[PDB]
């Protein structure tokens, strides 16, 4: 039953992850980091060329989305 | 000590860039994109504002992003 709750969370986080593709964060960075010394090329190289970065980026988006899935189910129970 | 000075520059660049990326910019990204994908506004905000572990791990990834971009930027500064 806790194990049925984790299922709901994982399914929900599956859907959320789809609505949060990586280009949203790249856009964010281009828009907010240029004034801080980071050029389009560097942000672009991170997002399009850097394998390790892409993966660690996917890991965290999954964590973000698992965490809010968790809270969504909390409010579903209240 | 040439490579240390490079890393120290990378690190200070990251310090600067980090100020451009407060957490609420990410909260807004999520409320703008996740509502069609199963999340309510409340759930996102609960994560961003009430969940202390989320905040810390959020801060740390942001710091990771900025160090990695800083690294790429100094590489480009040396080509």
UniProtKB/Swiss-Prot annotation, chain B:
GO terms for biological process: symbiont-mediated evasion of DNA end degradation by host; symbiont-mediated suppression of host innate immune response. The keyword Calcium does not apply. Keywords: DNA end degradation evasion by virus, Host-virus interaction, Inhibition of host innate immune response by virus, Viral immunoevasion. One of its GO terms (molecular function) is deoxyribonuclease inhibitor activity. Both GamL and GamS bind to host RecBCD nuclease and inhibit its activities, protecting the viral DNA against RecBCD mediated degradation. Isoform GamS mimics DNA, preventing RecBCD from binding DNA. Expression of this protein in E.coli renders cells more sensitive to fluoroquinolone antibiotics (which inhibit topoisomerases and induce dsDNA breaks). Frameshift mutations that delete most of this protein (starting from position 78 or 97 of GamL) allow the bacteriophage to overcome the retron Ec48 bacteriophage defense system. Homodimer. Interacts with host RecBCD without displacing any of the subunits; this interaction prevents RecBCD from binding to DNA. The GamS isoform makes extensive contacts with RecB, and inserts deeply into the RecBCD complex. It comes from the Viruses. The keyword Chloroplast does not apply. 2 forms, GamL and GamS are isolated from overproducing cells; the shorter form (GamS) is more abundant. As both have good ribosome-binding sites they may be independently translated. In cells with an induced lambda prophage a protein consistent with the size of GamL was isolated. This is Host-nuclease inhibitor protein gam.
């Amino acid at each position: 039953q806790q194990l049925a709750r984790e299922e709901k969370e994982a399914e929900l986080a599956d859907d959320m992850e789809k609505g949060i593709p990586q280009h949203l964060f790249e856009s964010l960075c281009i828009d907010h980091l240029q004034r801080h010394g980071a050029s389009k090329k560097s942000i672009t190289r991170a997002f399009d060329d850097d394998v390790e970065f892409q993966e660690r980026m996917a890991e965290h988006i999954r964590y973000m989305v698992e965490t809010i899935a968790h809270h969504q189910v909390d409010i579903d129970s209240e």
